[PDB]
């Protein structure tokens, strides 16, 4: 019986400047075994290209810069954990749409 879980479980975003966002998510349970997060962002819809970066598991916030004022972006945060066999896996990710201004 294959299963997946949502990690992170809450994602908050706010415009920092017309060209940047502050984002934050919930720190994981220790039981989730998270090793890093991948953050992606790009224009909303149509499986459009994303820029991406990773932060370590000890982070629960990031900034995203170089955005276009007013443009709708989709921000997604993925969590990668390590299973009992010593292999990495992806939790089900969280996403939000947002724009500066």
């Amino acid at each position: 019986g294959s299963s997946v879980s949502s990690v992170p479980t809450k994602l908050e975003v706010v415009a920092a400047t017309p060209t940047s966002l502050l984002i934050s998510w919930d720190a994981p349970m220790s039981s989730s075994s998270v090793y890093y997060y991948r953050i992606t962002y790009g224009e909303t819809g149509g499986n459009s290209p994303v820029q991406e970066f990773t932060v370590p598991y000890s982070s629960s916030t990031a900034t995203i810069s170089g955005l276009s004022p007013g443009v709708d972006y989709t921000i997604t945060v993925y969590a990668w954990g390590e299973d009992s066999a010593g292999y990495m896996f992806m939790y089900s990710p969280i996403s939000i749409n947002y724009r500066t201004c």
Partner: protein, 100 residues
């Protein structure tokens, strides 16, 4: 043939991958055959001194992938892709581990 590629190590164990990556740097990696499930391949990837192990999945239509959204017809295409963008890996695939 796959064995021509320095990144392709064939049947080596998880512990052997630690040895093969011992004097690696960030992005040093190898593709190997998994002992926890045969016919299955894995990427072992060094980052900040730790080795991370990823299953290479085979889709029902034969394509290969680490991340579900990015599937490829061949292992070479998969390695090429993840050498330019991490796309789920902790870092990009950079330097093949030396073979021993």
């Amino acid at each position: 043939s796959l064995e021509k590629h320095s990144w392709y190590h064939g049947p080596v164990s998880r512990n052997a991958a630690e040895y093969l990556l011992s004097s690696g740097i960030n992005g040093s990696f190898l593709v190997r055959e998994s002992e926890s499930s045969p016919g299955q391949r894995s990427i072992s990837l060094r980052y900040e001194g730790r080795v991370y192990h990823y299953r290479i999945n085979t889709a029902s239509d034969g394509k290969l992938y680490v991340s579900s959204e990015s599937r490829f017809n061949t292992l070479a295409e998969l390695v090429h892709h993840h050498s330019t963008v991490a796309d789920g890996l902790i870092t990009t695939l950079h330097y093949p581990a030396p073979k021993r």
